[PDB]
Amino acid sequence: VSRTSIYYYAGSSRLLAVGNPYFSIKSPNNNKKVLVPKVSGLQYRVFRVRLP
Amino acid sequence: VYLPPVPVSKVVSTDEYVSRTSIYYYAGSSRLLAVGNPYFSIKSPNNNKKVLVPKVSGLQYRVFRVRLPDPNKFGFPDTSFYNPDTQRLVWACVGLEIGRGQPLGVGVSGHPYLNKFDDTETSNRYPAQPGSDNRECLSMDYKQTQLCLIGCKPPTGEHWGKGVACNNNAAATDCPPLELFNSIIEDGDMVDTGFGCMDFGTLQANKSDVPIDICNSTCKYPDYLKMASEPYGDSLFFFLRREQMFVRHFFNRAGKLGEAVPDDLYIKGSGNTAVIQSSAFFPTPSGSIVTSESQLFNKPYWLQRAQGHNNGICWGNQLFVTVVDTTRSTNMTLCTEVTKEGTYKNDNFKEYVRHVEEYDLQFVFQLCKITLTAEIMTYIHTMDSNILEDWQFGLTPPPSASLQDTYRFVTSQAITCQKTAPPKEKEDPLNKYTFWEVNLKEKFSADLDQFPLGRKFLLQSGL
16 A cells, blocks of 8 residues: 555534434334334444445 | 635734833723622512612622723833834733632522422432422522633623524424524523523523523523634633532423333333333533532733734723633621510511622733734725724725726605615624723823732743
């Protein structure tokens, strides 16, 4: 591997992240989609960033 | 084919065009006097708009707006080092000190109708209690908070409240959307103690689970990301912050369980377990131990370069400082008897409770004379017309014109009404808002060595 001196910025904006601590709630009598997901911080947190 | 989309003119920090001198000027104030009730301003009961006894707590926000005299409206013996025509003059803060001459101590409070149900700390035996009114008189504590922050622009608040709803929709409950709002941190409003940064009037139908001073309030959070987002560097020059917290006990809410748990994840029981108990738990905010050594204050704090593009430089002769201390937020207690006897009864005595704070300051600055060129005068009005017009120099028209006449008439409003928009100069956006204000314009001093920070300073500089 070589090395260039060509540096670049990468910065995101604000994110939407809010919701239910305990469990996802499906649509009643549909139960294929969900109304509000389980949103909990003690879970692991992965994000698939997309870079050029 | 792909290309760089846009070329943009460059921004430059306030160092290279800023021509620094070596002449320094002092700031420092006398004894502060401001007091009030810890929980609520006593209205006069007849006229409940004017106060009887005010309100102040350590849990209130403490933001301050300062006032400084004009550098150009000053008498000096020797203007030899610069042209008064070609140069302008401006202040930046380089020497800083904030202390408080009170002892420590945190105030404790609570709420007399607290909506508790049962002890989820150690034991909840089965079955549970009924009751229509299950409120009690209990107290609670707070997370310990210290910070110190400084910029020429006011600190921004951000705070919770209700959110973007949708149309007439079918298969959901009240799943309430929530959208944050932004503001500016004002003075007197309450801060957070770990309960989320929302309004407590619009979200408390009971208002019987929230403490008494925050029973209607709206506590904010500082938008550290968005305050790191402005490339002026003028809303923050330097910051410190320090907090600590743990929790003592655990209890649950009391009411109709708004949403239900699916039975897939537990066994249904009967008898004592034919019911399903309320389980909307919460912690007990406590905070922690205090030292004489974890302080953020009462020391010399020299600055060498402010954290953004502005180098500690004031505009409009003002700054904006925020300090929190619940550490010195303990409260006094009064007792006056009404009658006299040789026999003790509790119905003889009258008890008041107050909350006191003192603040003090000491600063030193340095003159940076600023010459005025063509590339300079184009640069400032893109930021502000306001910092230009003070110099009484002249005016640049913001257009040179446009390509539209925009429907010229002479005939003065007889058939079809349109918007005419009568403006007002209004002379400040801050005219609706309250901060704590102070003067410097006759506390002026060039000498430093009568003053402990200036006595602290000249050993840094060795002069």
